[PDB]
Amino acid sequence: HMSYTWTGALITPCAAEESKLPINALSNSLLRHHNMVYATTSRSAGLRQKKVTFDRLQVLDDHYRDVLKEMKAKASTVKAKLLSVEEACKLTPPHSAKSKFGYGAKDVRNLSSKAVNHIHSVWKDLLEDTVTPIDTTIMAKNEVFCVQRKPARLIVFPDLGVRVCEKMALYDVVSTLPQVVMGSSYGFQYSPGQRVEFLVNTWKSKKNPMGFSYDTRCFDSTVTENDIRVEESIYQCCDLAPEARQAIKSLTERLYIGGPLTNSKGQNCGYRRCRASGVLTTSCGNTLTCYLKASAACRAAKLQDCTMLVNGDDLVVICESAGTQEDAASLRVFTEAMTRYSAPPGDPPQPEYDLELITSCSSNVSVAHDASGKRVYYLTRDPTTPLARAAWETARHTPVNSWLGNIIMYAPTLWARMILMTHFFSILLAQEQLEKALDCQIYGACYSIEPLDLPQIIERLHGLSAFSLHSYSPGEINRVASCLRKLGVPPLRVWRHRARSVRARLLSQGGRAATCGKYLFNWAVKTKLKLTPIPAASRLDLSGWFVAGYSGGDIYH
Numbered sequence: 257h258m259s260y261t262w263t264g265a266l267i268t269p270c271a272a273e274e275s276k277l278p279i280n281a282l283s284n285s286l287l288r289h290h291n292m293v294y295a296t297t298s299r300s301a302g303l304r305q306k307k308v309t310f311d312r313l314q315v316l317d318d319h320y321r322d323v324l325k326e327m328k329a330k331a332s333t334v335k336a337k338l339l340s341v342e343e344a345c346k347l348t349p350p351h352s353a354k355s356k357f358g359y360g361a362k363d364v365r366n367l368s369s370k371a372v373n374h375i376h377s378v379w380k381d382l383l384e385d386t387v388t389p390i391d392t393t394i395m396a397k398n399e400v401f402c403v404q405r406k407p408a409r410l411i412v413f414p415d416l417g418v419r420v421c422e423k424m425a426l427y428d429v430v431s432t433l434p435q436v437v438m439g440s441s442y443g444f445q446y447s448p449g450q451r452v453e454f455l456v457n458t459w460k461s462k463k464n465p466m467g468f469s470y471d472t473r474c475f476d477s478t479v480t481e482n483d484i485r486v487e488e489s490i491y492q493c494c495d496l497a498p499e500a501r502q503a504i505k506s507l508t509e510r511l512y513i514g515g516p517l518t519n520s521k522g523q524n525c526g527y528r529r530c531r532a533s534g535v536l537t538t539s540c541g542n543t544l545t546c547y548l549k550a551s552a553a554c555r556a557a558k559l560q561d562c563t564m565l566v567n568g569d570d571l572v573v574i575c576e577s578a579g580t581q582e583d584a585a586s587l588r589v590f591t592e593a594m595t596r597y598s599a600p601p602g603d604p605p606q607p608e609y610d611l612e613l614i615t616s617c618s619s620n621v622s623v624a625h626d627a628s629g630k631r632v633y634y635l636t637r638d639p640t641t642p643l644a645r646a647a648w649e650t651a652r653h654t655p656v657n658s659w660l661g662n663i664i665m666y667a668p669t670l671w672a673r674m675i676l677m678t679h680f681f682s683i684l685l686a687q688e689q690l691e692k693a694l695d696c697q698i699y700g701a702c703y704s705i706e707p708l709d710l711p712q713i714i715e716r717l718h719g720l721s722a723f724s725l726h727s728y729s730p731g732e733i734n735r736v737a738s739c740l741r742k743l744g745v746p747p748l749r750v751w752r753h754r755a756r757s758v759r760a761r762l763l764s765q766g767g768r769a770a771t772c773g774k775y776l777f778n779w780a781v782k783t784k785l786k787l788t789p790i791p792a793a794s795r796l797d798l799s800g801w802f803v804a805g806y807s808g809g810d811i812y813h
C-alpha cells in the first residue's frame with residue numbers, strides 16, 4: 257500500500273533552472289535582500305520523493321459510509337454532458353505541454369487535423385481498453401519562496417491528447433457536481449467578497465464560536481485506491497451519456513488510481529498509487545474526499561453545529577464551542593478519525609476563538625473601515641511569498657503572473673494596494689504595456705486579463721469599498737512592516753509617494769488608464785475623487801470565474 261515505488265532514475269528538467277533571484281535595474285526599488293529569495297529546482301526532487309513516499313492504512317466505519325450515502329443521493333440529481341472535441345480544445349491553455357505525438361497546444365486550439373485525429377484515437381482507445389495503465393510524466397515544479405528551504409513540489413500529468421479526453425468526459429461533471437453534493441461548503445463557488453461574507457456569517461451564526469484549520473500531511477499521497485474508486489462511484493451517480501460512463505471508468509482504472517512515472521528524458525522513474533497532481537479531477541477528487549473524511553470525522557468527534565468550508569485539500573471547520581477543555585478533546589477525536597481514514601495531520605489542529613487568527617486558503621479575516629467609517633471585513637495574508645514572487649517577476653517574464661492574481665484576489669489589502677499596484681503600474685507605464693493582456697491563475701484555471709480592466713474586476717469581486725478602505729488593524733499593519741524589514745522593502749511612506757507619481761501619470765493618459773489612476777490610487781491623495789459605480793463593471797463577463805477549482809486541471813477560461 258505504498259503511495260509510490262521508485263526505480264532510482266532521476267526526475268529531470270527540460271530546460272535550465274535558475275535558483276537565485278534574477279536582478280535587473282528595477283529590483284532594488286522593490287526588495288534589497290536578494291539572498292532571501294529563491295526558486296525550487298529538480299536538484300531537490302529527491303528530497304520531495306522521500307517526503308511523499310509512505311504506507312497508507314485505512315479503516316472505514318459507519319460514519320464514513322453514512323456520509324458517502326448522502327453525497328451519492330445528492331450526486332444522483334446531477335445531469336452532466338459530454339463536451340465536443342472542439343469545446344475541449346478551446347479549454348486548453350495556449351502554452352500547455354505539447355504532445356509526444358507531433359502536435360502542440362496551439363494545434364489543439366486551432367483544431368488541426370493531426371491534433372483532432374489523434375484525440376479521436378485516444379478516445380476510441382479509452383472506450384475499448386479499461387485496463388492498461390496510462391503513461392504519465394513526472395517533473396519538479398519551479399516555484400519561488402522566501403527562505404524559512406522547501407524541496408520542489410512534484411507534478412504528474414498524462415499526454416496532451418489524454419488531457420483533452422479528460423475534458424470531454426469530465427469537465428461538466430467536475431465543474432457542476434461539487435456544489436450540488438456539498439452546497440455552501442464548496443469553497444470554489446465564492447469570489448473573495450463572497451468567501452469573507454460566508455466565513456463571517458458562519459462565525460456569527462454560532463453562540464460561542466470555535467474554529468480550526470486542518471493541515472493534512474501531503475494530501476495527494478494520502479489518497480488511496482479506495483478513495484479514487486469511491487470518487488468514480490460518485491461521478492457515476494450522475495445522469496450521464498453511456499459513452500461518458502465508459503470513459504470515466506476507463507480513466508479511473510488506467511490513469512486516476514495509478515500508473516507509471518516517466519521523466520522528461522523518457523526513462524521510467526517508478527509507479528504511483530495515489531492522486532496525480534496534474535489531472536482534471538485532482539481538485540474535485542480532493543474536495544470530495546476531504547469533505548467525506550472531514551464530515552465523518554466531525555460526527556465521530558461529536559462536534560456541535562458544525563460548518564465546513566472545503567477547497568480541495570484545504571479544510572476549515574467552524575462550530576459551537578463546548579468549553580476550552582472539551583473543544584481540545586473533540587479536536588483530538590477528529591484528528592484520530594481523519595488519521596484512521598488515511599488523512600493524518602502535518603501541524604496538529606488548534607481550536608481558535610478569534611476568526612482573525614484562523615488561516616484557510618492561505619488567508620485570514622481582518623477588518624478596516626470604508627468612506628463612511630463603516631467596518632468592512634476582508635481577506636488578507638502575510639505578504640512575504642507574494643512579494644518574493646513579485647521581485648522575481650520584476651526581472652523575469654513568467655508564464656503565470658502571480659502579481660496580477662495577487663492584486664485581483666487581495667485588492668482590499670494595504671500591501672496589494674500600496675506595493676503591488678504602485679510597483680507594477682509603474683513598470684507598465686514606463687514600458688507602454690498598459691494594454692497588453694497577461695496570463696494568471698485563479699482557483700487553478702488560467703485567465704488572460706487586461707490590467708486596464710482591474711478597477712471593474714475589483715468592484716465585481718470586492719465592491720467599491722475596496723478603493724476606500726483605511727484604518728487597517730494594528731496586527732495587520734505590523735505584519736506588513738515586519739515583512740518589509742525582513743525582505744528589505746522600502747517603507748510605506750515611500751510607496752505613498754511613488755503612488756502619487758504613478759496616479760498622476762495614469763490620469764495623464766486619459767481613458768481606461770485614467771480610471772485606473774482614479775480608482776486604484778485614490779488612497780494616495782488627501783483631496784479625494786468621488787468613486788462611483790463603474791459602468792463597464794456591469795458588462796464584464798465573469799462567467800467561468802468562481803464556479804469550480806481546477807488545480808492541475810489544464811484549464812484556460
Ligand SMILES: CCC(C)(C)[C@H]1C(O)=C(C2=CS(=O)(=O)c3cc(NS(C)(=O)=O)ccc3N2)C(=O)N1Cc1ccc(F)c(C)c1
Nearest residue numbers: 448451539542568569570617635661662698699700805807
Ligand atoms: C491568485 C490566486 C490565489 C491568490 C493563489 C488564490 C487561488 O487561486 C487559490 C487556490 C487555487 S487552487 O489551485 O485551485 C487550490 C488548490 C487546493 N488544493 S487541491 C491541489 O487539492 O485542489 C487548495 C487551495 C487552492 N486555492 C488560493 O487559495 N488563493 C488565495 C485566496 C483564495 C480565496 C480567496 F477568497 C482569496 C481572497 C484568496
